[PDB]
Amino acid sequence: QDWLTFQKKHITNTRDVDCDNIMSTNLFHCKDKNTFIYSRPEPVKAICKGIIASKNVLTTSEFYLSDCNVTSRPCKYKLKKSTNKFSVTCENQAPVHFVGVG
C-alpha cells in the first residue's frame, strides 16, 4: 500500500529467508506464497523514480529473489532462490505493491 509496508513485505537482508518462521506471522498469515527481494532498499526504490501517478513498471535490472512457496503441508514452505526481473506498482516515486516476477 505504501513504501514502508512494501519494505516489510518484500525486502529481506538475507537470501536465506526462514519461511516457516516468517510466513506464520500475522503479516503473512500462512498464505500460499510470497516473494522477497534480497537487496538494499535504494536500488528497489530507484525503480520508481519520477513516476507520480500509480503505474506498473517492470525492472530494467535483475534482482536476487527468495520465494517462500507453500508445500503440500499447510503453512510449511520451500525456499526457492532465483534471479529475475519483476514488476511493481509505482506511486509517488516508490514501489507500493509487488505484482509479479519475470
Helix content: 10-25%
* CATH H-level homologous superfamily name: Ribonuclease A-like domain
Q: In total, how many beta strands? A: 7
Please summarize the sheet with the most strands. 4 strands, mixed
As for the number of domains, it is: 1
Strand order of the largest sheet: 1-2-4-5
* CATH topology title: P-30 Protein
The shape is globular
Helix count, DSSP H or I runs of 4 or more residues? 3
Rg (C-alpha, Å) = 13 Å
The N- to C-terminal Cα distance equals 21 Å
Estimated structural class: alpha+beta
Elements, N to C (H/E) = HEHEHEEEEE
CATH architectural group: Roll
Please write the CATH class name.
Alpha Beta
Strand content: 35-45%
Enzyme class: hydrolase
Active site: 10, 97
Protein name: Protein P-30
Binding site for substrate: 31-35
Task: Write structural notes for this entry.
This is Protein P-30. Its EC number is 3.1.27.-. By secondary structure, this protein is an alpha+beta fold. The chain has one domain (about 1-100): P-30 Protein (Roll), CATH 3.10.130. Helix content is about 15%, strand content about 40%. The protein has three helices and seven strands, in the order H-E-H-E-H-E-E-E-E-E. It has helices at about 5-10, 20, 40-45, and strands spanning about 10, 35-40, 55-60, 65-70, 75-85, 85-90, 95-100. The strands form two sheets. It has a four-stranded mixed sheet with strand order 1-2-4-5. Strands 3-6-7 form a three-stranded antiparallel sheet. The longest helix has 8 residues, at about 5-10. The chain is globular, with a radius of gyration of 13 Å. The protein starts with a helix and ends with a strand.
